[PDB]
Amino acid sequence: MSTLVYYVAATLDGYIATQQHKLDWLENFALGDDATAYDDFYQTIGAVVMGSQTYEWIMSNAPDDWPYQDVPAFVMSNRDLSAPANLDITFLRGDASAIAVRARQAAKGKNVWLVGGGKTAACFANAGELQQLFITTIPTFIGTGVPVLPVDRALEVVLREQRTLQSGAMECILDV
Ligand SMILES: NC(=O)C1=CN([C@@H]2O[C@H](COP(=O)(O)OP(=O)(O)OC[C@H]3O[C@@H](n4cnc5c(N)ncnc54)[C@H](OP(=O)(O)O)[C@@H]3O)[C@@H](O)[C@H]2O)C=CC1
């Protein structure tokens, strides 16, 4: 009922990060005003969900500014991680149907935003639990990197919306 949406910025080579998990390619390229505005998307979200890698990247890179304080956060790991005792975060593991249902509830009928990364998104997809994708594409190939959706087997999707920006950047919504 509440949808698992994977909202993610990707290279033409289908990488969400460079091999050393950097993101210059994106932060160094101006998107343009014509781009669907972040708040318009976030407003449709009452739950974020992610992996151990993406989390450590927000904490190391933005320590005193969590970006999802509005909403409950799920960080996937099989480790013994803790977060700042003020922040709204719950560490889960194992199967993804169970995680999904937990995540959907906490969304309170708004959508669950799979922030990433690939490994994690792949995990949900592998379980048929991932529903739609929102890829902003940057006009560049980095050659090697963090796979956007490393599924075990081929995932058929259905283009639903597609914009091209004046910047050469590109946005598209796809349904599983
Ligand atoms: N817009 C964008 O382009 C975005 C880019 N990124 C980039 O992506 C990078 C990380 O992506 P990526 O490395 O592919 O993967 P993830 O961020 O998903 O992290 C992977 C880790 O998630 C844990 N995990 C995943 N699924 C499960 C499960 N079912 N049960 C238990 N643990 C689980 C494991 O950690 P453990 O060791 O703890 O078991 C696994 O190693 C970030 O570093 C960032 O650079 C990230 C988000 C958005």
| Strand 111-116, strand 45-51: pairing | parallel
For residue 30, how many other CB atoms are within 10 A of its CB? 8
Specify the 3-state DSSP secondary structure of 40.
helix
78 lines ligand 1 (CB under 6 A): yes
Q: In the PDB record, what is the listed experimental method?
A: X-ray
Specify the 3-state DSSP secondary structure of 172.
strand
Among positive and negative, which fits the CA dihedral 88, 22, 154, 138?
A: positive
Q: Whose CA is closest to atom 11 on ligand 1? A: 117
Distance CA 50, CA 7 (A): 11
Distance CA 58, CA 53 (A): 9
8 CA distance to ligand 1 centroid (A)?
A: 13
Distance CA 66, CA 2 (A): 24
Could you tell me the two tokens for 143? 């050659």
Short-list 33, 44, 43, 36, CA closest to 9: 36
Could you tell me the two tokens for 21? 């998990």
Helices (H), 62-170: 96-107, 118-126
Range of the domain at 150: 1-176
Non-local (6+) Cβ contacts of 20 within 8 A are none
> Are 111 and 3 spatial neighbours (Cβ–Cβ below 8 Å)?
yes
Non-local (6+) Cβ contacts of 105 within 8 A are none
Helix and strand counts by DSSP (H, E) for the chain:
5, 10
Question: Which residues, in sequence order, are bridge partners of residue 45?
Answer: 111
Number of compact structural domains in the chain: 1
Distance CA 56, CA 35 (A): 28
Helices (H), the chain: 24-27, 38-42, 52-61, 96-107, 118-126
Mutate to test the pocket of ligand 1, among 23, 53, 134 (most ligand atoms within 8 A of CB): 53
146 CA distance to ligand 1 centroid (A)?
A: 9
Non-local (6+) Cβ contacts of 125 within 8 A are 149, 151, 155, 176
Atom of ligand 1 nearest to the CA of 57: 43
76 lines ligand 1 (CB under 6 A): yes
Encoded amino acid at 123, one letter: C
